[PDB]
């Protein structure tokens, strides 16, 4: 289930969008509500430094694969 | 009094935003100079969060009504 | 001939939405009720002047420029236009839209004078548009 | 005539890909060498699903996109792209590029009937930039240092990988591996490349120095 | 027509170098295999890319290049090297053997169009002889 | 006619080189500005001889001819030096340009009678370069952390110094700078440039962001 | 014909700098002195390398070159700069700017012969504006 | 007096190789014999590391700059 | 026998180098097999620290002869 | 026609060179004096074969040919050398001085025949001039 997935205390980012996006496109979802509810996702799961990253971005974000990418650039190294 | 307008600590922005526009709108200066004093009232008031949340944005903001969108975008949920 | 909203009602709608806020479904129906005739630009205006405070206000005449401007760009796609007519003179304007055209600007009057029924509409119809974007937005 | 390629192949280079990762060089090789024919966009596309993870993947595309755009650019900055033509009816729009245009959506057949070699060769290679930058992406040299026990052979392998894996420019790798190689590797082999006779001049001048004189230990 | 090198074969002779290091007989033997024909220089300059470590690497870029200026004198000094041609317009300088001349940078295809036969035979050889030194040099 | 240099001049520039050092900018734009005029051998020659310690004179007499010959190599290269002349028989020779042809030896009016305006600027620029040299000679970036209590403008302007004053190329430093703020200057301000929503491409953009949100302390 | 600057009023306007700081009006003062004839691009940045720490330095760097990009923005909005030209050949690019077009890295009497002296005061203005930014920056 | 010239164990090699070259060239040796005179009083003064330094010189050094600058280069940090 | 020859550890060089030279040239080998002999007998005998000295010979020496001189000039006085 | 040396006087100078040394005064004295009439390269090498050890012996052959090359490089600087003669065809190669040309190689007997006397006298003062110059170099 998509709307089960929570990004781990331990967990990466690449593996959690990975679990995230499998799930959400083996789904019943409609394929034009794919992205949204994957960005909502990206947004609301993705622990809150993460959620904090993606809130304070001075670009506006409009795909799964922008996000990825803007997170895993100023992601905290550790 | 505008040039006396503080962002409370426990205030939101948008109540500060609206007493700061209310106080510079209704004062003695001219109407071509109140977009640009808002500007440098939002940038050096609004304690020093929100002050690096606009100082660091990638896109340029030349109107009230734009700090405001991005800022609360943007935001630190508490 | 022009005739203002009534202040009873613009004063019930301020209280409205100062009290219930910008996205209540009531707050809504209300807006869609005193937006029920074709309003001048000058009608619109005033009205967003006086029930949304000064930032929504600004972020209001923002969206209302954006959709003005997509439906200019859908009238320079489509010469049968309510708005527009059918020669190239007849072309309509962002400046006659937000009423900032020659013989409007300040005069309501006037503004109804010159304006379609069809620009009405058009201009009703963004402002509607406009005031959900912003509520979205604000809350 | 659209042939498909190999879902062993395809598999082998899954595999290599999941065991090895995106960037080690045997992997890029691989892909260089199933990239080695002009590829229809139904077939890089289809390749990246299979090999690429799904966030990767969405990188991928993004990646793709960019590049592909910059190609547009360059294409109506020169008539004379090969994907393009003389006239103005052969401009190539990012439709016909991304497989999207009229009579391709879907089908490999009309794709290999309507594309030209040129269109082929310009996609393969934004492809093959677009998974380089991908890779790069996905997965620091200013911190390594020679530990204590460790050899000189181990330090240099550990230096050389950081170095020429990373974001530097091809022409600053081999001055950023001699100046860490005397300042890192700790003071008795900074002492033994410092009072050398000979000017060493390149990385392998300074390993081959270094494994000669060092001590024995 | 360039054709690439079976990666399959170059994981084995990976491992193969992985395993038994660079010394052993069986390695040489399996190098000379994958050195049966002659090779561009994108060709032999990936594969010890792939075979080798960084630092092997490095030694033997210096030792193909060294080897390789021993086989630029030798033409210098003789013009009837398979290389070469006949009128000095066909001399072959270091970028068209290590593979940087012009319209070769990068491009497999275009190096297999420019570059003799006796071109191919001469960097490989260099590029054996190379590994040679490389391998008895490491251990 | 010669002239030579104001002794109050080259008491100041001698007193500048002795309290600053070889390598200090003011220096060497002290140096440019005495090296403004084309000098004579003699006086170049007299000038290094008061400004520099014996040991220094002796690096620079070095420098200075192997910097000489590299320009007569370069002469030989092509005849359409300013120093040399069309004809075979103004060719200029190493002891023309050292001051030890005929008619030079010891005498600075001569000197000044039989030399080209394009030998007295090669010979100017060779001896510029030759300080040059010497100075780096005479008096490690991948060594420097910032310490736990040091504060970040120190940490920036040791760096910076560090990797300026080395023997990198220059177009290789802003990388090296900037890849060496990433990877020192320990993990609070390294995660302050990790999450940085812009991209910071210049060591001095890097600086500004970091003195803005730095966590006073 | 290029005449460098004294060395003792630069030391005694990097002392000046060193004990009253950048933002000084003194400082300012002294800087404007200093800058009253128009400099070669060497001069300005070889004195902002003496008279600057290094990190100073860097942030004029940015700031310097932010003002000539302004500069030349406004140039190629405007066809009638004293550094550009009438027709499109003398076009003033960042090259010649900064000092790294061709003749002139590196050689001030190169540069003295082939700047305009428009170019050599918009230089000037431009590093005394970027100077004025990095002093409101560092304290 | 030249041949008194010895390196300190504390001092530096410029310090003593600048003492040394003073001393040599405001004596009464002719001009011919000073250069021959500095390398084999770096040679043989100049504390036994140094020495050590200077004997297993793969070059031939044959001028007392080129024994400065490789002596420079190859000195013990301390 | 030539191949057991070591150079003691109070042995000088050049008593080192007579005994080899001796027992290889007075031996069974071809007389073209000789120097070849001696130079990797010195270069493998002669104790480690002779052997780094010509190990770090920044010139290739290619007679018994240059090797002698080499190792004579940069040996350690002891 | 040659004649050797009598052995009596090399068994003399050998145990001279081995009792007081290859630098005393008298080694060097009864050197020159062995060293009076030119001698053949055959003489010289079987000399310096006896009076010297294995290794300063091999000294002696390097040092020998540095100065017959210095020689050479004179002759090739001088076309009138005693060596040397008028035409091209009398010119002296190292094969010649060494005794390693066609018609000497082992044979005294042709070398004698061949040779021109100031090709003695030269090949006479290099071997001195080695001769001290590794008696210089090994103690």
């Not at 929570?6 to 019943?28: H, T, W, Y």
């Not at 509500?33 to 809130?55: E, G, N």
């Amino acid at each position: 289930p998509w709307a089960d997935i929570m990004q781990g205390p331990s967990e990466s980012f690449v593996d959690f969008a990975n679990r995230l996006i499998k799930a959400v496109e083996g789904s019943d979802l409609p394929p034009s509500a794919r992205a949204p509810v994957i960005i909502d996702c990206f947004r609301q799961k993705s622990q809150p430094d993460i959620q904090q990253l993606i809130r304070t971005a001075p670009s506006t974000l409009t795909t799964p694969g922008e996000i990825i990418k803007y997170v895993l650039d100023r992601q905290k190294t550790a």
